[model samples]
Target chain A: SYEILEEVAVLSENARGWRKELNLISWNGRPPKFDLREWAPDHEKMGKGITLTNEEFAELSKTIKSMLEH
Target chain B: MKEEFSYEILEEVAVLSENARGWRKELNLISWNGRPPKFDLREWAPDHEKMGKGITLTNEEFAELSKTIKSMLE
Candidate 1:
């Protein structure tokens, strides 16, 4: 879906978008269904940009990288 | 069949050796600074920890690596 930019931005801990509540889909392109997990905005003040602290993001990235090295 | 048991006893010799060890640590495992990376470490190879065991590159080697990585537009 094409995202239209709004003049105002919000910030939050969760992802933005998803006008209609839906479940995360799998890679097989089946109906949007996967363990019934839903992500909604917990904080709207963070604005549109995806921002993660260097420390926080690094922890996640390093975990994945460690797996790939083996 | 009873006489066949002496055939190998005539002459036979073989040599074999084996050893097992843990995997060598990847460079990143040693050098990673536990930072989220305002920059890519693989590209910058930045030193966050000074006087630490992570450093393997000599001054000349560091210079050479920097030349290649820095040329890219971050």
Candidate 2:
């Protein structure tokens, strides 16, 4: 019913006691689920995860690529 | 330009990676604003490039993740 497909994190920056991280998670199923998360410095989760469908993930990645190219 | 910001480093948990340069995958517990810190997983490149991504989870989601990871490890 529910299984973790993938989980990955990328480091950004940190200060004395603070750090910033981005996490990506994927789950398997019929529709599938992908999520992008923003971790705060103190590791206190701020809000619910930002869920993205497969199509949304693709588009978001593409958008990021385009921004980087620019 | 230097900006001023502050946060506390709670804890760091290591994850798996397959990179010759020795990838750094870790989960960190941090306290910002106050108590009941947040949870985050981060990866670092040996060269310290800005090509990494991470996630921020809510307390509930983080608890769920912890449960899942524990289950997976078992």
Candidate 3:
């Protein structure tokens, strides 16, 4: 099962109502993993999902923060 | 002064396929950290990885590409 960790709305003029969501998912006996998903508006079934490890997430967060600070 | 790099779409209009009811072709502009933005056409399969694949293009190429696709749709 997957659990929602965080969700943020993305402003898109082309694809309206797009949102970005982060989730924690685990399968079988494996450890939990993080996934970032971009969901299309008005459709629950159609979207893009990307898997990321903890280290990658940290790096990504840092980059985003830097971009935001500037 | 702070410098920032990002992408902006020059065009993102889509044309519904004439032959298919729910099919559409998306024309987009993508920038790979460009100061003056440009968009690339992008598409992918549902089972593929996120942002699976896309080809970058300049404004002129994108216009030509869109023209070709629109003509085909007609």
Candidate 4:
């Protein structure tokens, strides 16, 4: 159903052995987007997640910088 | 700072949660960037003047998630 274009980061893991992660994923061979979700070992399965374009992510980065200072 | 974004609500699915602030967590089909509609889950403010960061899933992805049995989303 999807393709993992790149492995970006593993944020954390749950007791159930699912790791929250960020990756560049291409769904149905569409343009790749940064996806944040949980995946089982060896990417066998996954959890619900959010996908963001580079522009949207850059917008979030600015907000995070200010949010961190507060 | 003002951030620019746009979305078209093609269909309203269901409400998951609502806070005292009148912010409601909802699932809907949305066309973002006028590209295509996807299953979007997120918190929206009253009248939808604002929204929180959200999760957007493709139809296939949502289908996979839905296979987790049935819903008791009460």
Model 2 residue B46 CA deviation (Å) reads: 4.3
Give the winner by TM-score.
4
lDDT of each: 0.25, 0.46, 0.41, 0.66
Which prediction has more favorable TM-score, 2 or 4?
4
Candidate 4 TM-score over all chains jointly: 0.49
Q: How far is A41's C-alpha from truth in model 1 (Å)?
A: 13
- Model 3, which residues run further than 4 Å from truth? A1-18, A40-46, B1-74
**Candidate 3 docking class:** incorrect
Error (Å) of candidate 1 at residue B68 is 23
TM-score of chain A, every prediction, order shown: 0.26, 0.49, 0.52, 0.82
> What is candidate 2's lDDT per residue for A4-69, written digit by digit as tens?
355444334345434332344434455446554444555454433355545544443443343345
Residue B41 local lDDT, model 3: 33
Q: Which pairs clash in model 4?
A: none
Q: Where is model 3 chain A poorest over a 10-residue stretch in terms of lDDT?
A: A5-14
Per DockQ, the best of the predicted structures is 4
- Per residue, candidate 1 scores C-alpha lDDT tens digits across B2-59 of 2332321222111111114322111232212432212111111122122212123333
What are the per-residue Cα lDDT tens digits for candidate 1 across A1-70?
A: 2222221221112334521111223335433321111124542322222212334233433443433451
- Steric clash count of candidate 3: 5
Give the Cα-based TM-score of candidate 1 against the true structure.
0.17
| Weakest lDDT window of 10 consecutive positions for candidate 4 chain A | A61-70
Model 2, chain B only, scores a TM-score of: 0.53
Best by lDDT: 4
